């Protein structure tokens, strides 16, 4: 889903995708919480993958029960 | 970034502010300038959080954001005021005392108007100015004029080698607006219509609130060089604390990237 | 649909006309502020300048 | 809307044709003329 | 591309610069001030001309 977070806009007349006021609308994005966000799915993603490979060891283990 | 986006905006309209001061103070010498000055004006504001009421008796600061968004410039007025007279002796040339600009024809067939009072006379006899473009009115000179005089309700006479008596040759109105302030201005010191200011209304010197005509003087610009200073000055200690700005927000985004 | 590329693009240009100084040459020409001088170009058609 | 100035340069340079204090000379060759005229 | 104008958009095209040369040195061959040296065997133009 988008975000509804408002839209900076700055004022540039020239661009043909200026409205009546020459609000020229750009993407609002926090540079800062995309750092974050990336960094905190990749430790995430690293402790699932090792969640998985114990519970693989582990059945493996147990598959030569006696 | 909000940052650098907005210092973009600041900077820009510090050099247009200088770029006036630079051309008001270029052409100081010149006959009939009326001086400039531009004035910014504040974009629209975002609010993020409505500012909350609390209305509990608690003396608390209002808990609202508003983010800015930059300055722009909104236009450069120009201050018609009556400049000094300086006397150039010679006797074709006509300083108006008041408000009022001549009618002078383009050769597309429009008409502009000009303050400058610097009037020569062609091969033809017609008065035109320096440049070659010449008045609507189209006052013609005969040839062994004696001397050429110019009265103050824009008669303008000349005298022959006899008939013991002067000989009009024509008539020299002048044209008012309602807002002298809107109009374009191009080169060769020309003012043109638009739609800020009303229609032109013609009239003879002295009559309607037009201004009367001295003979042998002309105008120079009302340009304050002791005020001109104080804005450069004030326009560089600007530009540079917008530089610091900048610099300021790209080290802190460098930091923020370095890890 | 998650991955959005981004490719660069230039619109055409910028007409804001540039400063001007005087070197009273007698065949320098500057133009108004939406002044075009015509050449011929190398192919024959003809092509717009300042 | 806003207008921004470029500058001013010289458009034309006029001379005054006025008429110039005579300064007598004792030579019965040297002509001052009073008035309109040049000679050819 | 074609926009047609359906809706106010902006070209998407994309050209790369290359850089800037020296394309000519001219002289500007306008008359010079003349000085005085009050020397017999020196000449001063006047207007266009060359000695050989």
């Given at each position: 889903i988008e975000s509804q977070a408002p839209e900076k806009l700055v004022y540039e007349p020239g661009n043909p995708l200026a409205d009546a006021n020459g609000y020229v609308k750009m993407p609002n994005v926090d540079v800062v919480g995309e750092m974050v966000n990336t960094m905190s799915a990749s430790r995430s993603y690293q402790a699932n993958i090792e969640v998985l490979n114990t519970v693989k060891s582990m059945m493996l283990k147990t598959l030569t029960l006696g | 970034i909000s940052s650098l986006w907005i210092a973009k905006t600041g900077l820009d309209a510090q050099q247009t502010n200088m770029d006036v001061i630079a051309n008001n103070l270029a052409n100081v010498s010149t006959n009939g300038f009326k001086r400039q000055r531009a004035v910014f004006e504040d974009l629209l504001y975002q609010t993020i959080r409505q500012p909350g009421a609390q209305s509990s008796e608690q003396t608390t600061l209002p808990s609202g954001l508003q983010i800015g968004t930059g300055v722009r410039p909104v236009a450069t007025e120009r201050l018609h005021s009556q400049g000094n007279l300086s006397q150039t002796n010679n006797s074709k040339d006509v300083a108006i005392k008041g408000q009022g600009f001549f009618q002078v024809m383009l050769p597309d067939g429009t008409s502009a108007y000009t303050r400058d009072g610097s009037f020569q006379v062609d091969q033809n006899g017609q008065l035109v100015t320096a440049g070659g473009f010449q008045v609507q009115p189209a006052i013609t000179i005969p040839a062994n004029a004696l001397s050429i005089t110019i009265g103050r309700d824009g008669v303008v006479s000349v005298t022959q080698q006899g008939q013991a008596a002067p000989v009009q040759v024509g008539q020299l109105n002048l044209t008012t607006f309602m807002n002298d302030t809107g109009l374009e201005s191009i080169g060769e010191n020309l003012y043109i219509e638009t739609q800020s200011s009303g229609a032109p209304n013609e009239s003879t010197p002295?009559?309607?609130?037009a201004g009367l005509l001295y003979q042998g003087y002309v105008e120079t610009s009302n340009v304050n060089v002791a005020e001109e200073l104080v804005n450069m000055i004030q326009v560089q200690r600007a530009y540079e604390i917008n530089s610091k700005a900048v610099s300021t927000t790209d080290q802190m985004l460098q930091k923020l990237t370095q890890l | 649909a998650t991955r959005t590329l981004v490719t660069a693009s230039t619109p055409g240009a910028d007409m804001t006309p540039g400063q001007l100084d005087y070197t009273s040459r007698p065949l320098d020409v500057a133009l108004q502020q939406d002044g075009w001088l015509v050449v011929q170009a190398a192919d024959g058609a003809e092509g717009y300048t300042r």
């Open positions: - | 002295g009559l309607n609130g | -």
